[PDB]
Design an enzyme around this catalytic site. Sequence first.
Site, short mmCIF file in Angstrom:
data_model
loop_
_atom_site.label_atom_id
_atom_site.label_comp_id
_atom_site.label_asym_id
_atom_site.label_seq_id
_atom_site.Cartn_x
_atom_site.Cartn_y
_atom_site.Cartn_z
N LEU A 16 56.66 34.20 24.87
CA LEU A 16 55.96 35.50 24.91
C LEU A 16 55.01 35.73 23.71
O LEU A 16 55.25 35.23 22.60
CB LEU A 16 56.95 36.66 25.18
CG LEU A 16 58.13 36.99 24.26
CD1 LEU A 16 57.67 37.70 23.00
CD2 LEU A 16 59.13 37.87 24.98
N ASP A 17 53.96 36.52 23.96
CA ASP A 17 52.75 36.60 23.11
C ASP A 17 52.95 37.35 21.78
O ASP A 17 53.00 38.58 21.76
CB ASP A 17 51.60 37.26 23.93
CG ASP A 17 50.25 37.30 23.19
OD1 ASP A 17 50.01 36.53 22.22
OD2 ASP A 17 49.39 38.11 23.61
N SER A 18 53.05 36.59 20.69
CA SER A 18 52.83 37.10 19.33
C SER A 18 52.48 35.99 18.33
O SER A 18 52.39 34.81 18.69
CB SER A 18 54.05 37.89 18.83
OG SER A 18 53.74 38.59 17.63
N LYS A 19 59.58 28.97 18.58
CA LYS A 19 58.92 29.79 19.60
C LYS A 19 59.86 30.91 20.06
O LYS A 19 61.00 30.62 20.45
CB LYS A 19 58.50 28.95 20.81
CG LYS A 19 57.81 27.61 20.52
CD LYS A 19 56.49 27.76 19.78
CE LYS A 19 55.91 26.44 19.33
NZ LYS A 19 54.59 26.59 18.66
N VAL A 20 59.39 32.15 19.98
CA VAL A 20 60.13 33.33 20.48
C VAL A 20 59.85 33.42 21.98
O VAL A 20 58.69 33.35 22.40
CB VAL A 20 59.69 34.65 19.78
CG1 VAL A 20 60.52 35.84 20.27
CG2 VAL A 20 59.82 34.53 18.26
N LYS A 34 64.78 32.87 19.47
CA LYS A 34 63.94 32.18 18.49
C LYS A 34 64.50 30.77 18.37
O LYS A 34 65.58 30.59 17.79
CB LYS A 34 63.90 32.91 17.15
CG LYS A 34 62.95 32.25 16.16
CD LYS A 34 62.55 33.14 15.00
CE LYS A 34 61.48 32.47 14.14
NZ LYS A 34 60.14 32.63 14.65
N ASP A 127 59.49 41.41 3.88
CA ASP A 127 58.46 41.20 4.92
C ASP A 127 58.50 42.31 6.00
O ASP A 127 58.41 42.05 7.20
CB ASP A 127 58.61 39.79 5.55
CG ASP A 127 57.34 39.32 6.28
OD1 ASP A 127 56.25 39.95 6.20
OD2 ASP A 127 57.43 38.27 6.96
C1 LIG Z 1 68.60 37.43 13.88
C2 LIG Z 1 67.33 37.83 13.07
C3 LIG Z 1 67.08 36.91 11.84
C4 LIG Z 1 67.46 39.31 12.64
O1 LIG Z 1 66.64 40.11 13.04
N1 LIG Z 1 68.44 39.79 11.81
C5 LIG Z 1 69.56 39.05 11.19
C6 LIG Z 1 70.26 39.96 10.19
C7 LIG Z 1 70.15 41.28 11.01
C8 LIG Z 1 68.61 41.21 11.36
C9 LIG Z 1 67.90 41.44 10.03
C10 LIG Z 1 66.82 42.30 9.94
C11 LIG Z 1 66.20 42.52 8.70
C12 LIG Z 1 66.67 41.88 7.55
C13 LIG Z 1 67.76 41.01 7.64
C14 LIG Z 1 68.38 40.80 8.89
O2 LIG Z 1 69.46 39.98 8.98
C15 LIG Z 1 66.13 37.69 14.03
F1 LIG Z 1 64.96 38.13 13.40
F2 LIG Z 1 65.94 36.36 14.43
#
Ligand SMILES: CC(C)(C(=O)N1C[C@@H]2C[C@H]1c1ccccc1O2)C(F)F
EC number: 2.7.11.1
Lengths: 276, 266
Positions: A16-18, A19-20, A34, A127
């Site tokens: 999908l468009d933005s 591998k996820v 992901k 980020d």
């Molecule tokens: C699984 C992934 C890494 C994810 O969103 N998270 C993991 C855990 C909760 C959540 C998350 C959000 C933001 C910062 C850390 C964090 O750590 C995804 F982006 F693939």
Amino acid sequence: NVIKMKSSDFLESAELDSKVSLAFHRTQGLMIMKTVYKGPNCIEHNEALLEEAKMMNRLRHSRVVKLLGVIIEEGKYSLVMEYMEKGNLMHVLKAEMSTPLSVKGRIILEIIEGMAYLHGKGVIHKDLKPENILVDNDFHIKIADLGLASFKMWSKLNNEEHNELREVDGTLYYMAPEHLNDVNAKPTEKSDVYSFAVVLWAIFANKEPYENAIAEQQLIMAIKSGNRPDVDDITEYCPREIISLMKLCWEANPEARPTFPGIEEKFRPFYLSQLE
Amino acid sequence: NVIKMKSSDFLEKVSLAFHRTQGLMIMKTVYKGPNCIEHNEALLEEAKMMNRLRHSRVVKLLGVIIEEGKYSLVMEYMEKGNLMHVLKAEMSTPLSVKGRIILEIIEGMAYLHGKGVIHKDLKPENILVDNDFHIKIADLGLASFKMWSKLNNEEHNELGTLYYMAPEHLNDVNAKPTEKSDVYSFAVVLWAIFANKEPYENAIAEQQLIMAIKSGNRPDVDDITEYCPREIISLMKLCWEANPEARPTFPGIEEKFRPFYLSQLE
Ligand SMILES: CC(C)(C(=O)N1C[C@@H]2C[C@H]1c1ccccc1O2)C(F)F
Ligand SMILES: CC(C)(C(=O)N1C[C@@H]2C[C@H]1c1ccccc1O2)C(F)F
Ligand SMILES: [Cl-]
């Protein structure tokens, strides 16, 4: 504990468009996947990847994207996460049906709640950006870390010679000026408050900042010397208090910026009295 | 750090307090009397511990007055008072508001358990409500704070409990409370929310009721003459299991209850 999943448990995987990619689990329905590495079999970091998967599973909150499982197989390592129907925040802000002020207000408070959760457990995001704010069909949001900034072993696993799905090397609009052309500097809670500031502007602009910048170094140096998103480019009604909040949060000096509990204390009663 | 406040900073026992620059607060004055000098260091260190708990669903300690012969905790103002007082009013609370009250209770208890705090005395009296019906968990009896609680019950000082208590603690004061002790309290808080009253009205003795509860008896589900949904009744029965290990955790409650709240009740 981490749920260990298999590739055979998923039927199809559409990129999908933005591998996820969107993934249908055979018993539990629709999920996001992901796939971080695909290549030849090297089982070197599997203990650290699973322990890092455990750590990311420990971060449970209504405004944070849950890791549902991991696929740890011979030559393929994937993260599996919950499905958020409307996509990322910027995708929702650009859509034909316009988002009202009350929903925007609620989006900002949910962002604050989630960032407060993460900072409360010692996690700096590093980020924060619209791409990392995912939206469900009821417009409720969840913060993700799709760049793997908090998870070194999974991030280093992407940048590898064996990987077919390698990252050959958006972020910089939301990165605090202290970090632009400064790879060594340690991010803090204050670095995320800068990103949030730029996310606020974007929520009332319905677009990415700095459209008129030509080159990357032009923009980097501009931001480091005080330039911010153009507040007059906000066409629609953004309240005075939210403009004041984004200017406070994008201060050049980190210590001049508030923290997220300090934001919440100000913002929540404003959300309830003025926006709800 | 904890903010050290003065009596001169306020214009006025639990009472309404106007801070001279910051507006309205509540002041629980725990001791008024002669000067007790020895344990001011332990009271301030215990005040620091209660100051670390910052959350939208928890009552914030805004400051402490540690002065000559007067010791007060200063906390945020909650206009509608406790949960039981709001449930008893002439204007009824709708089901959507009740659902949101339950989710906020879950959020707050998950916050507290995340910081290693067991409440040990969750009950409607400790759930305060603002003018928009949003809630915060309080510890008005100082169950987590021994030095401040013991400072109240002192000789120089010139200033229904059992219904929410898990059976493991009834007739067993020595047993250590857990996260599951609070899950039982919450279960009884759920019942109370749909009943609009305290449980066990028809019981006639303390010892009869205690032993009844220890041998499995619970609040009367037929006393609910409002619409409580089926799945909230299922949730309270799960949360009031005799065995602590059979009860869910607060993250486990939230995972079930939040999407139920969103799809069905909001
Ligand atoms: C699984 C992934 C890494 C994810 O969103 N998270 C993991 C855990 C909760 C959540 C998350 C959000 C933001 C910062 C850390 C964090 O750590 C995804 F982006 F693939
Ligand atoms: C100031 C008092 C004690 C208070 O509610 N709290 C202090 C901190 C946060 C909040 C609190 C709630 C529940 C448990 C512990 C706790 O500890 C108030 F009741 F006077
Ligand atoms: Cl949740």
